[PDB]
Subunit: 166 residues, 12 copies
C-alpha cells in the first residue's frame, strides 16, 4: 500500500507538469485583447481588466509547480556534496506537505470554482457602473476544476506517507 | 496474428501523436478571430463563440493522448524500482482498454461527425436570435473523421490482445 | 544501376522533407488574412475562402510525407523484436509503391497545375455571384509544380527496384 | 551553519533564473500596444511611454542575472587552463558581493516598490499636461516585490560566507 | 595554395548558411503587410505585390543552399554503404561547379543589383497605371550585393581545384 | 599580466554574444509599426523610415559578431586536417585586430552616440518637410553606448597581446 | 345657438390650418435620418422605416385640409358666374359633413392613438426579426391626440347645422 | 350638365397645382442620399440611381402643369391686345385636349403603376449584377396613382365640352 | 392710467410675437443632432433625448401665442356679421385672462427656471444609468426667463382692466 | 402672320423663365457632393470637378435670361422720362437679335449636346490619369436639349419681325 | 444743423437694420459645427463652446434693434387712438436715449473689441485644460467694430437733439 | 449724350443688384466645407481658411451696394420733408462719385484679378508649411472680373455727368 503510493505520486507530478506546459499558454493568449466593455471612455477597459483578473491563473500555476520542487533540489545538492541523510528526508517531507496545502488553500480563496461571462465595474475613469464581457469562460472553469482535483490527490498521498512513518 | 498486433499498435500510437503535434495547432489558430456575427451589440460575438465551441477539439485530443499513456509510465516506474510483474501487466491492459473506449464515446457525444458553417445563437446580450459564421469548416470535419477512425483501430487491437490471453 | 538507385531514393526523400519543413509554413501563413472579396455582406469572405481552398496544400503534403514512412517503421519495430525477413521486405516494398502512386494521383485530381489570381463565388450568404482575390498565386504555382516533379522521381525509382527483383 | 548556506545559495540562484526565463517575457509583451492617452495629437503616446518606462524591468533583470555569473566563468576558465587558486576564490567572492549590492540599490532608485495605473505627461508634442493609462499594473507590482525579496536573500547569504572566512 | 583553398571553401559555406538562417527571415517578415498603393479599388494591392515580387529572395536562397549540398550527401551515403571512389569524387566536383554557376546566373537575371522604392503597376483590377510603395528597400539591396559576392568567391575556389587536378 | 588577458578576452566575447542573442531581438521588434508621421499622404511613412534607419542596429551587430569569429574557424579546420602552426597563429591575430578596429570605426561613423525622438524628412512622396516620431529612443541609446564600451575593451586586450609578442 | 355655431366653425378651421402650416413641418423633418436598427445588413433600415411609417402624418393632414375646402371653392366659382343657390348650399353642406367623417374614421384606422418608441421588423433583407428605434415619439403622440380633438369638434358643429335646417 | 363641367374643371386644375406645390418637393428630397447598394466599388451607386430613376416624378409633373396652361396665356395676350375670338377659342380647346392626352399616355409608358423596393443593376463600373434598395416606395406609389386619377378626370371633362359644341 | 394700459398691452403682444418668430427657430435647430451620450449601445441617444425634452420650448410658445388670440378672432367675426356687443366684450376679456394664467402656470410646472448641461438617464435600451450632454444650455435659460417676465406683464395688465370695469 | 408672332414671343419668354426659376436650382444642388473619384490623394476631387465643370449650366442660363431683358428696361426708362421713339424701337430690336444669337452659339461651344457619366482627369495633385463619376447625367442632358430648342424658337421669331419691317 | 440730424438718424437706423437682416445670419451659421477641440472625451466640445460663446452676437443685435423701436410704436398707437402730444414726445426721446446707451455699454462689457482664434478651457468633463479652435475670427471682429461705430453715431445724434430742445 | 447717360446708369445699377442677389449666395455656400489641407493636426484647416479668405467676396459686394445707395435715401427723406434742392443735388453727386472710386480701389488691393487653386500656409497650429486646396476657383475668378467691369462703367458715367455740369 505504501509501495504504490510513491509510484503514483511521481506519475501525478509529471502529468500536471505536462498539462500546464503544453496547452495552458494558449487558452489564455487572448485574455485582454478579447475583453470588451460598453463605453466610449478611454482607459476603462484597462482598469476593469486589471480589477477582474489581478494575477492570471497560468502564472500562479507555474509558480506553484516550481516552488513545490525546491526541497528535492536542496536534498540533491546536499547528497552530491556528500560524495544524517534520514533527518534531511524527514524535514523535506514536512516542508513539501506544508507548501502544497498552502497553495491549494490560496487557490480557493483567490479564484473559487467558476469564471463568469459578465463582469460589473466601478473604477475610475469609468463613469458610474459599466458592464464588461469575458473571453472563453467555460474552458477556463474546466481547467480550474481539473487543477484543484489533481492537487488534492497529491495532498492526500503525501499525508499518507507522513502518517505511515510517524 | 498476435505477433503483428503489437507492432501495429505501437505504429498507430506514434502516427497519431505526430499528426496532432505537427499540424493541428495551426488549423485552429484563428478560431475566434475569424468568427463573426451580424449584429451591432457589444459582447455577442464572445457569448456565441463560447456557446458554439465550449472545448476546442485540439485541447481534447492532447488531453486524451496524455491520459492513455499513464499506465505505461506507472509500469515503467515500478519496474525501475524492481531493479508479480505479470499481474501488473494484466491490470494495466484492462485500464488502457477502458480509457480508450471512454474517450471515443465522449467524442461522439460532444462533437458528432461534422462542423457546420452557420450557427444560430440566442444568448444574452444578443437581442432575440442572431446568425453567426464559422472559419474553415470543411478542414475541421476532415480532421474529426480521421481521428475517429484511428482511435477505433486502437480499440480493436487492444480488445484483440485482451481476448487472446483471456 | 540498381546500386545507385537506393542512394538516390534516400537523397530524394530527405530533400523533400527539408523543403517542406523549413520554408512552406511561411508561404501559406497569410492565406485567409489577405483573401478579399468585393462585398459589404457579413460572412461572404469565410464561405468563399472555404469553397476555394478546402484543404491547404501544406497540410496534404505533411500528411503524405508521414504516411509514406510507415512501412519502414513497421519493419524496424519487427526487426528490433527479432533481436522470414525477406518476405517482410517484399510486402513493404509493394505497399510503399501503392501509397506513393495514390498520393500523386490525388494531388492531380484535387489541385491541378496552377493557382489562379481571381475566384468566382456563389455561396450563401453572398448575393448572386461575387469576385474574390487571392494572395501570392505565382509562388504557390511554382511550389505545386516542384512537388509533382519530386514525387514522380520517387515513383519511377521504386518501380525500378520492384521490377528488378520481380 | 556554513555548510547549508552554499546549498541554498545555489538553489536561490537557479530559482530566480527559472522565474525570469519562463514567464516574464509574456507579462510585458503588450506594454506599449495597450498604453493609451486621451489626446488627438500624433506622437504623444510614443513620447509619454518613453518617459514613463525608460528601461523595461525584464531587460534590467536579464542583464543583472548575466553580470552576476561572470566571476564564476572567469574562475572556471582559469582552472581549465591550470590542467594561488585560493586567492582567486577570495577575490571573486569580493566581486560578487559588490555586484549584487549595486544591482539591488539601483533597482530601488530606478523603480521603487509600485507601478501606478495612471501617468501624467508634459512632453512635446503633447499640448500642456495629459493623462495616460497603463496595462497590468497589479501583476507588475507583485513581480517587483518578489524580485527584491530574492535578491535580498542572496546578499545576506554571501555576506554570511564573507564574514565566516574573514 | 591548393591546401588552403579547401579550408576557405568550408568556411565560406558555413558563413553563408549562418547569415541566411539567423537574420534573413526577419528582414522580409513585413513584405506584403507594409506594401501600399494609392487606390480605392479592392484587390489591386494583391495583384501588384505578386507582379513586383514573384519569388521572394529568402526562398530562392534557401533553395540554392540546399541544392548545392546534395552531391556531398550522395557521396556520403555511398561511402557508408562501402563499409572507384575517386571517380565519384571527380563527378561530384563537376556537378557542384555547374550548379553554383547556374544559381548565380539565375540570380542576376531574376533580380539584378537593386531594389527600388517605387513601383508602377498596370494589372487588373487596377484602373490604368497606379503607383505603389515598397518596404525597407536599402537593406534589401545591401543583402543582395553581399550574397552575390559570397557566391562568386565560391565559384572561383571550386574552379581553382577543378583546374588543379585537370 | 598576459596570463589573465586571454581569460578575460574569452569572457568578454561570450558576454557580448549572450546579450545580443537573448534580448536585442525584442527591443527592435516594433521599429516600423510604431513609427509615425503627421501627414495624410500614402507612402511617406515608408520613405521616411527607410531614410532614418537604413540598416538596423541588431543586423549590424549580428554580422560583426559572426565575422570576428572567422579566423578561429579557419585555424580550427587547418589543425583538424593536421591530425608552421605558429605562423598561422601570428597571421590570424593580425587579422582579428584589424577586423575589430574596422567595425568599431564604422559604428561611430554610421550611428553616433544617440538616437533622437524626432526626425525631419523631405523625401518624395512627402510634400515639403514633415515631422516624424520614433519608438523607444532612450533604451536604444543605452544599448548603443554599452556595445561601444565592450568592443573597446576587446580592442585594447588584443593590442595588448600583439605588442606582448612583438 | 345656431348663430354662434358658424362663427366658431370658421375659427376652428383657421386654427387648424395655422397649427399645421407653421410648426408641423419641423417635428417630422428628421424622421428617417434618426431612425435606427441593430444590424449590419445593408438595406434593412429602409425596409423597416417604410413598413413602420407608410404615409407620414403631416402628408395626410395637408391632404385632408385641402379636400375639405373644395365644396366652398365650387360654390364660389358658381356664384361668381351668376353675376337655385339654396339647393347648392344644401348639397355642399351634405358633402362637407360626409368628407370630414370619412377622414376622422380613416385616421383612427390608420394610426390609432399613440406612437411607440420601439418597432419589431421581419422584412427582407433583414435576417429573422430585428429591433428598431423611433425619433421623438412623445411629441408625435401629443400632435395626434390634439388633431383628433379638433376634427371631432368640427364634425359636431356641422351636424348641428344640418339637423337645424332639416 | 355643361354648366357645372366648367366649374369642376377649374376646381380640379387648382387642386392639382396645390398638391404638387405644397408637399411633393419633400417626399423626393432624400431620393439619392438614401439610395444604397451592396458593393465596395466606387461609382456604382451613381450609375444605378441614374438607370433606375432617369427623370424624377416631380420634375415631370411640374413640366406638365406648366405646359397645359400655355393656350390660356396665348388667348389672354391676344384678348389684351384686342382692347374672330370664337375661332381662337375652338383652336385652343383642341390643343389643350391633345396635350393632356399625350402627357397621361407618357406617364403610363415611363413609370407604370408602382415603385418597387428592390432594384437589380448591371451597369459599369459595377461587377456583374448587384442589388440596390430604394427610399419610401409605398408613399411614391400612392402619389403616382392619385395623379393618374386626377388627370383622367380632366381628360374626360374636356372631351365632354369638345363633343358638346361639335 | 387705464388709457395707457391698452396701448402697452398691444405693444407687449407684438414684441413677444416678433421675438418668437424671428430668432427662436434657430437657437433650437441643432437640439438632437448635438445631444450626445457616453455609450456604445444603439438607440440610447433617442430614448434619452425624448425623456429629457418631451415637448420643445418653441412648440409650446407658438401654441400659446396662437391660442391667446382666439377670442379676438371670434369677436371680429361676430362684428363683421353684425354689419349685445358689450356682453361679448366682457366674456372675451374673462376668457383671455383665464387662458394666460393657465399657460404661465403650465410653463412653471413643465420646465422650471433653468436648463442644465448634464442629464442622467435610465431608460431601455440603456444599460443601468448613463450620462448625457446638452447643447447651448445658457442661451436656453436666458430665453426661458425673458418669456416668463413678458407673460407676467401681460397677466398684470389684463387683471388691471378687469378690476377697473368690475 | 406678324400679329401672332409677338404673342408667341411673349409666351416663349415667360415659359423659359418659369422653367429655370422653379425646378433648375434643385437638379444641380448635389453636383460636387456626389462627384467622386477613385483615389486616396487629398485635393484630387476638387481639381477634377473644377476642370470638368468650369461654369455650371444654371448660372449661365440665369445670366443669359437677365441680359436679354436689358433693352426693354432701357426703352421703358426712356419712355417714362418722355412723359424719335421709333428709332429706339429699331435699335433695341437689332440689339436683342444679336444678343440671343451670341448666347446660343456660346452654349454650343461651351457644353455641346450631352453630359457623360465618366470623366478622365490628369490635373495636379492627381498622380497620372484617374477616373471620376458624375451625378444625374441623363436629366442634365434632357435639360440641355430642351433649352437649346426654346432659344432657337426665339431666334427665329425675332428674325421674322426684323425682316418683316426691313 | 438740427434739420439734417433727423434725416441722418432715420438713414442710420435703416442702414443698420439692412446690414443685420441680409448678411449676418450666414456668417454665424457654422459656429458650433466648425468649433473643434483636441480631445477624445465625449461632451467637451459642447461645454467649451457654451463657455466661450454664451449668447451669440447676432441674437444680441436683433434684440437691441427691436427694443430701440418700442417707444415709436407706443407713440404711434396713442396717436392713432387720438383720431399733451408734446409731453409724450419728450418722454419717448428720453427713453430712447437711455436704451441706446445701455445697449452700447453692455456690448463693450460682454464682448470687447476682438474675437481670438484660440480658446483655453477647463470645464467638466474635460480633463485639466484643453485647447480649442474657432471659426472665422477675422470676419467676426470686423462686424463687431462696425456695429460699435454705427451705434455710437446714433447716440451722438440723439443727444444732439435732446440738448437742442433742453 | 447726357440724356442717355442717366438711363444707362439706372440700368447698370439694377443689373448689378440682380446678379448679386439671385446667384452669388450659392457659388460661395460650400467655401469652408470643401476647403481641405494635407495634415493630421486638429485646427489647421480653420486657421488656413481664415488666413486665405479673411472677408468673403459676397459680403464685400453686398456692403458696397448698400453704401452707394445712401445719398439717394438722404435726398429722398429731405424732399419728403419739404412737402436749396439743387445744392443738395450737387453734394450728393460728389459723394457718390467718391464712394464708388474708393470701393473699386479697395477691391483691387484686397483681392486682385484671380483666385488660385492651391494655397501655402504657415500659421499655428500647423507644423512648418502645409499645402491646401480651394473649391470652385475658375467660377470665382469669372465673377471677380465681371464685377470689376460693371463698377468701372458706373465710375465713368458718374464722372461724365459731374464734368458736364462743372
Ligand atoms: C540594459 C540594461 C542596462 C542596465 C544598467 C542600467 C544603466 C542605467 C540607465 C540610466 C537611466 C537613464 C536615465 C533614464 C531616465 C531618468 O530620469 O533616470 C531615472 C533616474 C533619475 O535615474 C536614476 O535614478 C538612475 C540611478 C541608478 C543607476 C542605475 C545603476 C545600476 C547599475 C549598477 C550595476 C553595477 C553596480 C556595480 C558597481 C560596482
Amino acid at each position: 500500500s505504501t509501495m504504490i503510493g510513491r509510484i503514483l505520486l511521481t506519475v501525478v507530478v509529471i502529468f500536471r507538469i505536462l498539462i500546464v506546459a503544453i496547452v495552458g499558454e494558449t487558452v489564455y493568449d487572448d485574455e485582454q485583447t478579447m475583453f470588451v466593455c460598453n463605453t466610449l471612455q478611454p482607459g476603462c477597459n484597462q482598469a476593469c481588466y486589471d480589477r477582474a483578473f489581478p494575477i492570471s491563473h497560468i502564472r500562479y500555476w507555474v509558480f506553484q509547480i516550481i516552488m513545490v520542487c525546491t526541497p528535492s533540489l536542496c536534498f540533491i545538492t546536499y547528497s552530491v556534496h556528500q560524495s544524517g541523510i534520514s533527518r534531511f528526508y524527514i524535514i523535506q517531507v514536512v516542508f513539501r506537505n506544508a507548501l502544497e496545502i498552502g497553495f491549494l488553500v490560496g487557490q480557493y480563496f483567490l479564484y473559487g470554482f467558476s469564471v463568469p461571462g459578465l463582469y460589473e465595474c466601478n473604477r475610475y475613469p469609468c463613469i458610474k457602473e459599466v458592464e464588461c464581457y469575458v473571453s472563453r469562460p467555460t474552458e477556463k472553469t474546466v481547467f480550474l476544476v481539473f487543477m484543484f482535483a489533481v492537487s488534492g490527490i497529491c495532498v492526500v498521498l503525501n499525508l499518507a506517507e507522513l502518517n505511515h512513518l510517524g
